[PDB]
């Protein structure tokens, strides 16, 4: 190891008939990155270099508020609202993998040891014309884990809250945050898992149990009004105190799914199965500027 | 009590906080943490691995096929193999790699890059190439005796069947930046051309075509600025399994 | 020098006189579990040299149209002497690596495999949403092909599968490529059946070609567990 | 550059071998494709396989019958059509992509196949 | 992911006829299109490449053009010779392959 706070300097260089040595010759095939320097290949001037390395640090390149969940519902009287709908509350399992941009981001690791800072923001909006006015109503967000059961209503005593961590917050309030702590019964987090979480050869591939955090029960506190809203909950997350493990190569292809590492390219270039890389001409063509 | 005011950004969500917040579940005791290999840091330590360039941008080479350009012997001299266009932050045969996959989630970037080729030919193939950078402000070196101005490097295949071509920082300022704008002055890097230095000789037992693979890295002098949201993923819709929330 | 090396794991010995080096993975030697770091409270098993040593396996060959093999540990040696005995038996594991991939032709022969060992190697399926089912990921001492190596099977980049512990076999420089690797996983220990800590992939870069006459050549794999322990001791399982 | 095919004539449900040959180019850096005429029908391409051997693309009409092959040591393609049947009497011609796809400047002459 | 093109283009006393290509956003929209002539007994013969460049050989004539999609083939003169029967041809990206079209010219 080795504290590095700006990027390298530079130093001066001169010519060179060195017999037996050779600095830009190298051996890809050992698996070692070449050590060729700057001052090694051509002649360099003395360069004080002062740039820094503190915003590529995974802290700062992780740590950023970005939506895990995006859920709206309805905020009105189910009676003869029969379906699998949300009546007036909704389940969710914490997952880092219903949006790409934090999916990919997340991704670049094998191993991932994080708390997760968690921010509800709420708005809600009248159904319909016939404007009056938006509510100023209070939610719960109650943390339940992965293994355990949850409310089945909106008015269910499971909301009571004995032991599992809720909180309740307001509308027209600042979102709603908490820190939930490193949660996994290892070490870190399993970003990728090429096994199976039973041990009767029918568990589901690549999800173990022990790396998601729980279940988000979200509900309306209030009991409906004589009209209706659409009620709509973003979740946010950004990793703090964070150790990562092992990189790994960026997810090229769109993703298809949250629960599999399927792919199907894009129709054509770029991002295609056939190629990645947009296609040009032939290898000695350039988009380049003539005069 | 405390007289106190409320300041513009006052019950405001930023994205970018780092405060302390509250704990959800009080007196957890996380597991013991144990040594983990190949742990990181710093992003700068992931662009200066070498990764594969993607050269071979044709529609008549598919998947593997792109990650590699093939070396014929030619009847005529001085003659241009390839090109690579250096950008960065845009897409071409270095946008999926380490250094630029990782650099598009910034917009500003210094430092120097390190082009290194292998040659995958046969032991009993012979050659020698020159490898020349171009700094910016014209066209594309066609001829190698225009080339040969900037920076270069002849090597002669060997024992040693790889090269290193030192991309150096040579800017007016102290980064580059992204503005979609291939041909700003702010952005633009340079080329790299390949020419024949003498000729590719392979026996009548040996295959006549051999290929070179390409691989680019970032120097400890190189750097980055100003995170972005990487244009190389996005979506128009929800993902297949969306439960239940 | 770096080209004449020699492995020596247990009753088992591999020379090697065109190399190029080995590769520790992320600079780490194998080791055994310390006690800081130890969970499971009974007295680990630890079968020395009737384990660490080298076991070889099926040696595919490649022609024209080889698109690469990968192989899973320790699903390809759950079976092979007293290591996959030790498997069966016990419920827990732990063990580093020895891989060392053979491939020889002559001198005129072209031709570049790239040997990476890929960490939790998660695959992916084509045109469609169902995940991969149990035959398709343990496939046992045989391994499977890739059906797209260019995104190495799971939507990602083959070109940069170099911040992977790899090692390159160019036909013009050597023929063998020793990859060490250690204990990866985010426990200490690891039921052994129903999960791959690493995955041997060998892909062929640039392909094989010569205008001589054509011979087979085959690709052999050579894996050697390093400081295997076994916890757990129970009846066996099939 | 120079393309020759070799193949003609057989019983309803066998099968052959094409094995064109070319000469005038490095022809390992090239896509070689096969098109059938089928007389009273137009064109129609039938396959195409890349330098590497590795990526084939197998027009959808024909099913699984045809296996497109490659040699880059003695610059010969070969097609190999398997359980043939009346349908595909044709005169199959070998061409050479120009670098793009369905760009193909370069002909064989055709072999007749009557089934 | 087919390619269409008019069974029949008469008019032969020396106007200039058009021949043309119906695609999708599968084969035409965002690939080049390529124009090959056809005689019973002869290998087909490139005319256009790229929608509308003429390989060295061809005569001015073999316009050709595309619009979006609806590739368009002109020839001028309708001569002895240029009887024949035309083909567009194209890559398609859903089918993974090359598709013609065909149409005869009288």
């Known amino acids: 190891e080795s504290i590095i706070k700006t990027a390298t300097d530079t130093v001066k260089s001169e010519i060179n008939a060195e017999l037996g040595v050779v600095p830009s010759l190298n051996a890809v095939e050992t698996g070692a990155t070449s050590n060729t320097e700057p001052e090694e290949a051509i002649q360099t001037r003395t360069v004080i270099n002062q740039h820094g390395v503190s915003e590529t640090l995974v802290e700062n390149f992780l740590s950023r508020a970005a939506l895990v969940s995006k859920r709206s519902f309805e905020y009105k009287d189910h009676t003869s609202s029969t379906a699998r709908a949300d009546k007036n509350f909704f389940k969710w399992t914490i997952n880092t993998r219903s949006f790409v941009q934090l999916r990919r981001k997340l991704e670049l690791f094998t191993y991932l040891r994080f708390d997760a800072e968690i921010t509800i923001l709420t708005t809600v909006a009248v159904n319909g014309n016939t404007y009056v006015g938006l509510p100023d109503l209070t939610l719960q967000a109650m943390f339940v884990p992965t293994g355990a059961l949850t409310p089945e209503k909106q008015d269910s005593f499971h909301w009571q809250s004995g032991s599992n961590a809720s909180v309740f917050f307001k509308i027209s309030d600042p979102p709603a945050r908490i820190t939930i702590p490193f949660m996994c019964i290892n070490s870190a987090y399993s970003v990728f898992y090429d096994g199976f979480a039973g041990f009767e050869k029918n568990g589901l591939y690549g999800i173990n149990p022990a790396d998601t955090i729980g279940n988000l029960c979200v509900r309306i506190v209030n009991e409906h009004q004589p009209v209706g809203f659409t009620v709509t909950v973003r979740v946010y997350m950004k990793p703090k105190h964070i150790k990562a493990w092992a990189p790994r190569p960026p997810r090229t292809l769109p993703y298809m799914s949250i629960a599999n590492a399927n792919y199907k390219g894009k129709e054509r270039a770029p991002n295609a199965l056939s190629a990645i890389i947009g296609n040009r001409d032939s290898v000695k063509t350039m988009p380049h500027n003539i005069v | 009590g405390v007289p106190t005011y409320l300041l513009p950004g006052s019950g405001q969500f930023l994205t970018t906080d780092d405060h302390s917040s509250a704990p959800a579940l009080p007196c957890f005791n996380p597991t013991p943490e144990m040594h983990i290999p190949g742990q990181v840091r710093n992003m700068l330590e992931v662009v200066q691995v070498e990764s594969m360039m993607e050269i071979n941008n044709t529609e008549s080479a598919v998947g593997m096929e792109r990650l590699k350009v093939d070396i014929s012997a030619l009847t005529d001299v001085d003659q241009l193999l390839f090109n690579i266009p250096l950008d960065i932050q845009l897409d071409g045969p270095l946008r999926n790699t380490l250094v630029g996959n990782i650099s598009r989630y910034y917009t500003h970037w210094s430092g120097s890059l390190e082009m290194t080729f292998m040659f995958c030919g046969s032991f009993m193939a012979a050659g020698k190439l020159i490898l020349c950078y171009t700094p910016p402000g014209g066209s594309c070196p066609t001829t190698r005796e225009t080339a040969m101005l900037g920076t270069h490097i002849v090597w002669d295949f060997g024992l040693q069947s790889s090269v290193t071509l030192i991309i150096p920082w040579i800017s007016g300022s102290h980064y580059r930046m992204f503005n979609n704008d291939a041909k700003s002055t702010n952005a633009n890097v340079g080329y790299v051309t390949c020419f024949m230095q003498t000729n590719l000789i392979v026996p009548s037992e040996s295959s006549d075509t051999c290929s070179l693979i390409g691989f680019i890295a970032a120097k400890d002098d190189f750097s980055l600025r100003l995170m972005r949201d990487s244009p190389d993923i996005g979506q128009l819709d929800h993902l297949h399994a969306a439960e239940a929330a | 020098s770096d080209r004449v090396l020699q492995l020596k794991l247990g009753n088992s010995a591999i020379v090697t006189q065109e190399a190029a080096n080995y590769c520790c993975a992320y600079g780490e030697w194998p080791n055994y579990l310390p006690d800081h770091e130890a969970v499971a409270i009974d007295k680990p098993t630890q079968p020395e040299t009737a384990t660490d040593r080298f076991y070889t396996l099926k040696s595919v060959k490649w022609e024209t149209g080889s698109t690469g093999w990968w192989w899973k540990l320790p699903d390809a040696l759950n079976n092979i002497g007293m290591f996959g005995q030790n498997v069966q038996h016990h419920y827990l594991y732990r063990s580093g690596f020895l891989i060392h991939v053979q491939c020889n032709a002559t001198k005129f022969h072209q031709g570049a495999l790239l040997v990476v060992a890929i960490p939790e190697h998660q695959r992916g399926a084509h045109n469609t949403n169902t995940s991969p089912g149990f035959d398709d990921i343990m496939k046992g001492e045989e391994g499977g092909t890739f059906n797209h190596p260019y995104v190495l099977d799971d939507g990602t980049s083959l070109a940069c599968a170099t911040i992977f512990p790899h090692q390159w076999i160019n036909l013009r420089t050597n023929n063998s490529a020793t990859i060490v690797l250690p204990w990866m996983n985010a426990a200490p220990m690891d039921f052994p059946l129903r999960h791959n800590q690493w995955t041997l992939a060998i892909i062929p870069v640039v392909p094989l070609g010569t205008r001589t006459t054509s011979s087979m050549v085959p690709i052999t794999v050579s894996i050697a567990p390093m400081c295997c322990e076994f916890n757990g001791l129970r009846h066996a399982i099939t | 550059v120079q393309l020759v095919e070799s193949g003609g004539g057989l019983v309803k449900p066998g099968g052959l071998r094409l094995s064109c040959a070319a000469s005038?180019?490095?022809?390992?850096?090239?896509?070689m494709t096969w098109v059938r005429q089928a007389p009273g029908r137009g064109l129609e391409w039938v396959s195409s396989?890349?330098?590497?051997?590795?990526?084939?693309f197998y027009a959808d009409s024909l099913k699984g019958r045809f296996t497109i092959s490659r040699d880059n040591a003695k610059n010969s393609v070969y097609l190999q059509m398997n359980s043939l049947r009346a349908d595909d009497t044709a005169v199959y011609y070998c061409?050479?992509?120009?670098?793009?796809?369905?760009?193909?400047?370069?002909w064989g002459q055709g072999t007749l196949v009557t089934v | 992911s087919v390619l269409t093109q008019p069974p029949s283009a008469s008019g032969t006393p020396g106007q200039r006829v058009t021949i043309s290509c119906s695609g999708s956003?599968?084969?035409?929209?965002?690939?080049?299109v390529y124009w090959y002539q056809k005689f019973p007994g002869t290998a087909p013969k490139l005319l256009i490449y790229?929608?509308?460049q003429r390989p060295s050989g061809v005569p001015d004539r073999f316009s050709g053009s595309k619009s979006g999609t609806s590739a368009s083939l002109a020839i001028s003169g309708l001569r002895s010779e240029d009887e024949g029967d035309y083909y567009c041809?194209?890559?398609?990206?859903?089918?993974?392959?090359?598709?013609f079209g065909g149409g005869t010219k009288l």
């Open positions: 005038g180019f490095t022809f390992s850096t090239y896509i």
């Open positions: 956003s599968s084969n035409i929209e965002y690939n080049y």
């Open positions: 061409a050479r992509e120009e670098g793009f796809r369905a760009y193909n400047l370069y």
């Open positions: 396989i890349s330098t590497s051997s590795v990526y084939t």
């Open positions: 041809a194209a890559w398609d990206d859903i089918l993974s392959g090359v598709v």
């Open positions: 790229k929608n509308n």
